[PDB]
Design a protein around this ligand. Structure first.
Ligand SMILES: C=C(C)c1cccc(C(C)(C)NC(=O)Nc2ccc(Cl)c(N[C@@H]3OC[C@@H](O)[C@@H](O)[C@@H]3O)c2)c1
Ligand SMILES: C=C(C)c1cccc(C(C)(C)NC(=O)Nc2ccc(Cl)c(N[C@@H]3OC[C@@H](O)[C@@H](O)[C@@H]3O)c2)c1
Ligand SMILES: C=C(C)c1cccc(C(C)(C)NC(=O)Nc2ccc(Cl)c(N[C@@H]3OC[C@@H](O)[C@@H](O)[C@@H]3O)c2)c1
Ligand SMILES: C=C(C)c1cccc(C(C)(C)NC(=O)Nc2ccc(Cl)c(N[C@@H]3OC[C@@H](O)[C@@H](O)[C@@H]3O)c2)c1
Ligand SMILES: O=c1[nH]cnc2c1ncn2[C@@H]1O[C@H](COP(=O)(O)O)[C@@H](O)[C@H]1O
Ligand SMILES: O=c1[nH]cnc2c1ncn2[C@@H]1O[C@H](COP(=O)(O)O)[C@@H](O)[C@H]1O
Ligand SMILES: O=c1[nH]cnc2c1ncn2[C@@H]1O[C@H](COP(=O)(O)O)[C@@H](O)[C@H]1O
Ligand SMILES: O=c1[nH]cnc2c1ncn2[C@@H]1O[C@H](COP(=O)(O)O)[C@@H](O)[C@H]1O
Ligand SMILES: [K+]
Ligand SMILES: [K+]
Ligand SMILES: [K+]
Ligand SMILES: [K+]
Lengths: 349, 350, 349, 351
């Protein structure tokens, strides 16, 4: 059989910068469009935004701010079990807010999850580099066996088979993203990945049959990228780069060449794991001030995009929005071009 | 839901994706007719309209545009009395054609009343999303009150949106969602259609009704205008190539050692405040001098383009011009390459 | 609505979109014949013709081109008696082949007569749009007066334009609408055809009548010439790669301590002055020294390319060479990449 | 008729590394468990699928020794006399009985050079040639096969399936693939000839698999992932030049420029390599200094173990037979690299 040999270069993939959402007939204005989403009966968000579970993006201060904006924060796992549990307890104490927590597939995974459940965590995130492995499938089933009502967010994946395997394993939400992270080099050092917009659409196609929402994680650089991800099947997007520069994110502000910056590094980089083979890099990000100003520009772009597509809710955007593919020349026409920009826009660069 | 499996079926082309195919020509570029008829009371000698923006078109720009055979749309970022006076100023300047921009607001009727009493030739019901029930209901209200007033409705980018505004009374449909040089709509909202596909798709629906379409935004060089008109557009609307003109509002300022003019989107922070999630940027463009020199280069490129395609009038070019798709390597071959340019060209900058 | 539905059906390819597929070879590059025959009265030892531009070819350039085995086209930006003097000087220098470019004007016949009296080998009815009735009628007008004169009519880029000029009496058709390095026709008028497709489409029609086509413009490296010949062209025309040559008109101008020479398009403002809507730009090119060194690299790169394709002569390459289409990433792989070039090569600048 | 070749001129399409991505599949193995061993022949088995290029700025005695101790193979370049190369191969074989190869051109002194290398206990000779689909190369492969029936013969370079079949029938045990993809190469620019390397590897492996012949993916590998893509395209082993030139074991000394250390890396077809008139098919340049070879090899093998772990491949045969790609645009390439973040520190596998 040579079926696998002749199908190597058949599939095509698309990313955010390859398409545009086609405007449709609209009766609702951006001001009166609903942006709420339901990941599960216990996890309902006012805005479809989740801060990434990374050591440079989300701790308690970011999770508290995210939940108060209507979103969700994922406490990273690069800390002790008692430390992460103390932050989850700190968030839910500060007004009864939603909070998540990252958990790696390891031997101490169950012990870490036990402390988080005692801290009344709302969703554990079994985050790993390859969600389509048997070790993750087995560990997702163990958490469902011990905690039948616990929200399990499993990732990351990029194929329909992987999403189908995790849904059977007990995952309530499937996080899609293999490569697109702004600080990610997995596609470069390992050669493996799927274009994110095609990855979200392929995984959502399988997950919508079982009523399982998916999380588009990584690759979102502008507000429009989020609208393209949600319109491709995602119930919610996870952001890392666009949340690293906010004031509430962990770490202090640094001065470089006079301007204020913040440290943003991938969890697979050398510094974050402290002879290792990294799949991420360490970098800096401009300080953008408080989170409220960044969230406002994100939801504002979503409300504008939903107003164009005639979507009064994120379900109509998920079921009716149509894309149109474009070339590189179409992308340059989409951005500003042939004009010397004088000052900064709050929602562009 | 068949919509799910068809999400990524469509393809869209822009100006830099295609080239006009040269055909047999019995007419010289000097002998072609660039005239265009948009309605029974609106006929332009050149297919050029200056955008209704606070850095592009006012009284001085509209007067100059009409003297060249074009049309000028006075922007709406001013009081109703100030916009009506500039419309009257253009009309008393030799009987020139003039337009005015009106937003789809509750005071739109009050603004239109002053413009029609100022003998405005056309009103542009300009908004971000033309395919909304608010625009459809507004153009019908203007149609009922003024059955003979020319109504330009936009912006749209689909055939269904063009059908909605035509059947709602609009005489001309303006096409362009996201192509503007100062526009970030496709970036912040992720919504748009590649302009040449948008013009062609909208022109296909409007051609059934005998309705002209305006190609608005995305035109960086004079050749892009020839592609837009060949894709089905009766007339193009320019903003970037008109802001560096002396007749445009604002004064000259020295930047990068050269003379520059302020050019900003009407959806940017500065324009929305002087007349918050924006959909445009604030920038500047090189100073190009009087409008006469710029218009001559634009029309000259169109006359050359129509001469290559063998089109005597704009109808032949609209109905017979053929394109050919090219890659990015074709775009770099189309521009100058591997030669360090020493002097400016009047139709090619940098 | 057939014409309305077929507007965006055609697709064109240029040099940087393809590569020549290497084939079985029994001949070495040095043993390969590169001679070409454009007519019984015009055979060239090398498949190279210098462009008829005021900054590329005059008397001294045509002599050096002919003694290398090529051909020079004396441009038309000079008096009628001055051009006949230049054509005479080339024939006075050993009976060499020489051409002259004339425009489609009322004095075209008056200019051609003075050049035929000078025993010109080929007249070149150069034109921005060769598919015009004025060009077609003037080809019949010149052919009826000179049945034995070689007429190079252009420029065209479609098969229907090639056929229109052939039956008009033109025995050689020059192909190129837009690809010139100094050309802005595709930018100011929006009209053009990718040069590789334009040559292929014109060669397909011209080969039915045994008419050779000239690949004019768009050739920046020696490999682009091999692709143009492999597309069906008998000979290529160069302007940029011959402008920096000492034999080209004008003396050397210095810029940042380096030797340069002015290279401008015949449709640029400066060339036509010797209110105007130009289709070309004015620029400079690095001084490359004598023509013999540039031709050696060009013909040398052809011998290798013909060796890779197993072509003994230019007829086998025109009839058997295969291309393979590549993406922009293929072009980046084709050039040197991820290495800091320290020395400039004689054929790669 | 005769218009068959005329109408099929622009039909083929080619893919390179930056055109595709490996599609992750279900995996039961961890990257530390995967087997990276490969068998070009029973007398030439490499523990890692890495071969250093036979160039005067990449591989000599010190590099070939270091490559073999990591489980790879070094190809001694041919820009030296017969006694020098025979002694260079002898120096590697004396240094613990390590595997070593040597480059031999298709010339009159070819048999004289090969006889000195076979006596030096060489394990594989490489008929390195700009165009491997020539009759002189085909004749010279048969000539070596007739005299040394058990000698490993590596022939190249080719980029089509019919060329691969011609080299196999001539007697070559391994076929090198790569016409144009080299980082220092200008063949595709000066001669316009070539095939995108990932498509060339796939087409040549398709023909070579029918004869049970391994294929070497030569050239174009810029990062660790490009090797994984080349092996997943059907190649048994990859050959690297740019990613090995800046290694401390490479020939030549280091030079400091603006604080950073560099090392000269030039193509064999360049002027400088042929000098010690000419129409070159390569350029001369410099690459960053990467220190000892062990640090570069560790990242290469580490990235390969990660890719196979993503693809669910325990061995390299599973990756050759089962790995599926997905094609992407230039906008997919920018998403694959880091983006919109100012890199502050240099990663050991990404610069
Ligand atoms: C890319 C990201 C996000 C990242 C984040 C932090 C760190 C990493 C690092 C850099 C450590 N690389 C990584 O882990 N590579 C990898 C490659 C292939 C596979 Cl198959 C796996 N498998 C996973 O580890 C082994 C088992 O635990 C298995 O169950 C689990 O799936 C992992 C990478
Ligand atoms: C893009 C441009 C040119 C621009 C110009 C000035 C300002 C704007 C701003 C930045 C204000 N953004 C905008 O208005 N966004 C938008 C998005 C979706 C929709 Cl659905 C609508 N609907 C419109 O507003 C509500 C009703 O009045 C409705 O009738 C009308 O269609 C508007 C943008
Ligand atoms: C592009 C090049 C090479 C070039 C070179 C020098 C000068 C030019 C200029 C800049 C002058 N532009 C030009 O001429 N534009 C053009 C456009 C359309 C047509 Cl249809 C034609 N028609 C031709 O001119 C009128 C008659 O002579 C007719 O017979 C003939 O076909 C010409 C351009
Ligand atoms: C591209 C590389 C790697 C390279 C490396 C060093 C040097 C070269 C040079 C620059 C010398 N160019 C080269 O050799 N060009 C070439 C082109 C076509 C053919 Cl057909 C051949 N044929 C070969 O030479 C003639 C006969 O020996 C024949 O048997 C053999 O196949 C060679 C290039
Ligand atoms: O070190 C890394 N290697 C690979 N992926 C990473 C790494 N760190 C974070 N990610 C992923 O990338 C996402 C952030 O994407 P961003 O918004 O583009 O920065 C995270 O939520 C993770 O899914
Ligand atoms: O701020 C804005 N946001 C989005 N589009 C705009 C804005 N202002 C003007 N436009 C559009 O852009 C056109 C001009 O763009 P340009 O001529 O390509 O630079 C105008 O005629 C409008 O259709
Ligand atoms: O100014 C001009 N406008 C358009 N095309 C030109 C002009 N001048 C020269 N050309 C064309 O460009 C060719 C040379 O371009 P090059 O060889 O690519 O640099 C000439 O032989 C002409 O066919
Ligand atoms: O000068 C040359 N011209 C063309 N290819 C070359 C030349 N020199 C080396 N190569 C090839 O390029 C390979 C290495 O390329 P790299 O790994 O991409 O830098 C070598 O193993 C050779 O196959
Ligand atoms: K834009
Ligand atoms: K050009
Ligand atoms: K190369
Ligand atoms: K990435």
């Amino acid at each position: 059989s040579n079926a696998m040999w002749e199908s190597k270069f058949v599939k095509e993939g698309l990313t955010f910068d390859d398409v545009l959402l086609v405007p449709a007939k609209s009766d609702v204005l951006p001001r009166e469009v609903s942006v709420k989403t339901v990941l599960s009966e216990s996890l309902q968000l006012n805005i479809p935004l989740i801060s990434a579970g990374m050591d440079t993006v989300t701790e308690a201060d970011m999770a508290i701010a995210m939940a108060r904006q209507g979103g969700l924060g994922i406490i990273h796992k690069n800390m002790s079990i008692e430390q992460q549990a103390e932050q989850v307890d700190k968030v839910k104490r500060s007004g009864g807010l939603l909070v998540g927590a990252a958990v790696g597939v390891t031997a101490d995974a169950m012990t870490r999850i036990d402390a988080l459940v005692k801290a009344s965590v709302d969703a554990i995130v079994l985050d790993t580099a390859h969600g389509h492995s048997q070790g993750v499938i087995d560990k997702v089933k163990e958490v469902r066996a011990k905690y039948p009502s616990l929200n399990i967010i499993a990732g990351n994946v990029a194929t329909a088979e992987a999403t189908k395997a995790l849904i059977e394993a007990g995952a309530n939400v499937v996080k899609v993203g293999i490569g697109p992270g702004s600080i990610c080099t997995t596609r470069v050092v390992a050669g493996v990945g799927v274009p994110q917009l095609t990855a979200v659409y392929d995984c959502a196609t399988e997950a919508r049959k079982h009523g399982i929402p998916v999380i588009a994680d990584g690759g979102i650089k502008y507000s429009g990228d989020m609208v393209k991800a949600l319109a491709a099947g995602a119930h919610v997007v996870m952001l890392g780069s666009m949340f690293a520069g906010v004031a509430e994110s962990p770490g202090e502000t640094e001065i470089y060449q006079g301007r204020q910056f913040k440290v943003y590094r991938g969890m697979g980089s050398v510094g974050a794991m402290e002879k290792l083979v990294p799949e991420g890099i360490e970098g800096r990000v401009p300080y953008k001030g408080p989170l409220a100003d960044t969230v406002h520009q994100l939801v504002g772009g979503l409300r504008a995009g939903m107003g164009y597509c005639g979507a009064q809710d994120l379900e109509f955007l998920r079921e009716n929005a149509q894309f149109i593919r474009m070339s590189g020349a179409g992308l340059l026409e989409s951005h500003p071009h042939h004009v010397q920009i004088t000052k900064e826009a709050p929602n562009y660069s």
